[PDB]
Amino acid sequence: NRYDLMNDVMSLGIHRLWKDHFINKLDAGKRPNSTTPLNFIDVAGGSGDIAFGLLDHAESKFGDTESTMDIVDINPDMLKEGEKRAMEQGKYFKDPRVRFLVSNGEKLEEIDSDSKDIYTVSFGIRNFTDIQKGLNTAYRVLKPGGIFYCLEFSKIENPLMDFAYQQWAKVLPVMGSMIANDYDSYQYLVESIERFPDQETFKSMIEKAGFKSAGYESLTFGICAIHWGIKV
Amino acid sequence: VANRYDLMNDVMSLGIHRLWKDHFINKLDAGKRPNSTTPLNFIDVAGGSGDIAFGLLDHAESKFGDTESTMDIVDINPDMLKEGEKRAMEQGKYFKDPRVRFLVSNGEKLEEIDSDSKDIYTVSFGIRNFTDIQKGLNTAYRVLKPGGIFYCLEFSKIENPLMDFAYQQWAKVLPVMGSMIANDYDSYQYLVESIERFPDQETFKSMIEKAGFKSAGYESLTFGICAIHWGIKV
Ligand SMILES: C[S@@+](CC[C@H](N)C(=O)[O-])C[C@H]1O[C@@H](n2cnc3c(N)ncnc32)[C@H](O)[C@@H]1O
Ligand SMILES: C[S@@+](CC[C@H](N)C(=O)[O-])C[C@H]1O[C@@H](n2cnc3c(N)ncnc32)[C@H](O)[C@@H]1O
Numbered sequence: 210n211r212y213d214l215m216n217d218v219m220s221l222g223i224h225r226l227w228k229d230h231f232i233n234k235l236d237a238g239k240r241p242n243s244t245t246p247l248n249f250i251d252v253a254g255g256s257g258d259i260a261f262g263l264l265d266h267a268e269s270k271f272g273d274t275e276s277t278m279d280i281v282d283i284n285p286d287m288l289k290e291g292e293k294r295a296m297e298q299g300k301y302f303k304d305p306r307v308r309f310l311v312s313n314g315e316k317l318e319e320i321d322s323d324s325k326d327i328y329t330v331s332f333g334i335r336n337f338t339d340i341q342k343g344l345n346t347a348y349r350v351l352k353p354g355g356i357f358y359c360l361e362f363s364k365i366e367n368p369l370m371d372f373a374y375q376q377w378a379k380v381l382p383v384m385g386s387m388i389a390n391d392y393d394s395y396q397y398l399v400e401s402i403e404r405f406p407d408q409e410t411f412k413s414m415i416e417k418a419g420f421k422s423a424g425y426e427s428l429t430f431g432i433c434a435i436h437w438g439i440k441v
Numbered sequence: 442v443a444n445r446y447d448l449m450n451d452v453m454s455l456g457i458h459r460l461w462k463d464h465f466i467n468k469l470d471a472g473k474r475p476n477s478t479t480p481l482n483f484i485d486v487a488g489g490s491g492d493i494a495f496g497l498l499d500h501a502e503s504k505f506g507d508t509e510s511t512m513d514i515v516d517i518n519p520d521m522l523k524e525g526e527k528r529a530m531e532q533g534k535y536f537k538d539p540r541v542r543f544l545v546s547n548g549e550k551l552e553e554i555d556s557d558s559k560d561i562y563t564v565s566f567g568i569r570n571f572t573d574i575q576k577g578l579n580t581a582y583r584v585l586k587p588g589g590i591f592y593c594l595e596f597s598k599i600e601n602p603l604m605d606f607a608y609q610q611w612a613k614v615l616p617v618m619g620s621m622i623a624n625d626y627d628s629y630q631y632l633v634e635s636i637e638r639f640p641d642q643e644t645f646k647s648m649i650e651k652a653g654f655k656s657a658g659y660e661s662l663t664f665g666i667c668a669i670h671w672g673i674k675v
Contacts, residue, residue, distance in 0.1 A: 210456075217448060221622050374618075377618050383607050384611055387664075391455070429621075
């Protein structure tokens with residue numbers, strides 16, 4: 210919930226709409242005239258907004274109740290909350306299709322090479338101590354024709370909006386400290402967005418990982434962005 | 442609609458509003474004691490979603506074993522009360538319960554609520570939206586029994602100058618991000634202005650005393666970003 214709250218606050222809840230757009234744009238899932246089940250992997254899943262979102266979208270639009278989902282997070286306490294959310298909604302709790310896994314996105318040692326059709330990472334890759342290694346691991350995990358999809362904060366192009374965002378980013382750790390004694394969380398959040406490579410640099414890092422037909426779509430003037438790539 | 446209100450609460454308090462509400466319920470400490478046989482009559486106003494209402498009944502059950510006290514959840518917005526009924530259904534508690542009623546009504550008048558029928562009156566972050574605050578306080582006095590308790594959780598005036606300074610920068614930038622990210626300057630500016638025009642701790646206390654309440658008082662929370670105000674009928 211700590212990350213849920215910071216995402217709610219930083220984006221004023223609009224991250225929900227970014228996630229809805231992200232899922233609809235990817236448009237992943239087993240088509241009705243096919244019996245091959247897709248193997249999803251959602252890295253840095255946390256409470257599971259994307260993982261459950263992908264599964265829900267695949268069912269309602271395609272009638273897919275076959276595809277498997279691996280939800281991966283480095284933090285066991287963050288993962289548990291995802292499974293805790295799964296029981297209360299009562300849909301993906303104790304489901305053979307859905308696996309919760311404690312693992313580092315830079316390694317993913319438990320995952321087999323060339324085993325996954327769809328890789329997603331949503332607002333998590335910026336927290337990786339090594340972003341490139343995580344991108345290389347993403348490539349390793351996917352099989353030919355596999356789609357990499359990333360939702361993450363980015364660079365705001367417009368100077369006025371960026372200037373307003375910087376002040377927002379300045380006042381957040383101050384307010385987080387005074388009200389919630391949470392300076393470190395908000396400062397690390399703000400600094401992780403600042404350090405993160407812009408739309409073009411990140412695209413190059415995705416290409417450097419080995420992905421082809423790589424591109425991006427800046428959302429809400431580039432406060433965040435959707436990056437993609439296809440294997441081979 | 443209720444999601445929108447939960448979001449603005451999270452954003453303005455940075456998620457701390459849940460700690461305010463838990464302190465609010467714990468401080469009130471309401472419920473039929475195990476040495477008593479008389480159930481209490483609760484009224485909750487301007488909280489159709491049920492955050493405080495469900496919390497009050499849960500607390501009374503947990504601490505005292507009180508599973509008999511009645512609760513009237515009152516909101517002017519029918520959409521908010523639908524969500525509360527949806528919450529109660531999905532919760533598996535307080536849905537289709539004779540103890541719990543969901544009622545459409547204006548908090549300034551509470552016409553469907555009889556005089557001297559309630560033991561506890563609670564309003565949480567809703568009274569600042571009342572077009573006339575005094576009318577709401579007078580009505581709260583009317584529905585309460587002798588010995589009835591008025592309890593209020595609402596945004597207030599910050600008493601810590603450094604917290605105030607930080608808040609003023611917050612209040613300026615927040616609606617700007619509202620306009621830029623959410624395409625919604627109005628809601629956030631309206632929220633900031635509704636907090637600004639609300640009476641301070643001493644003024645609101647006076648208004649509660651003008652309603653007729655005795656032994657009135659307040660406790661500032663988080664440097665006075667919000668406050669708990671109370672009053673006892675006779
Ligand atoms: C804001 S959340 C993202 C949750 C969810 N994907 C969303 O968009 O709301 C960040 C999550 O990434 C996880 N994380 C951070 N570093 C990681 C790493 N190296 N490998 C896997 N997960 C990581 C954190 O534990 C945290 O739960
Ligand atoms: C932000 S919410 C309250 C937040 C949360 N549900 C709680 O009680 O802590 C404000 C609520 O007060 C209600 N409200 C506003 N003006 C009112 C009035 N004059 N009478 C009754 N309810 C009112 C609104 O419909 C809205 O649902």
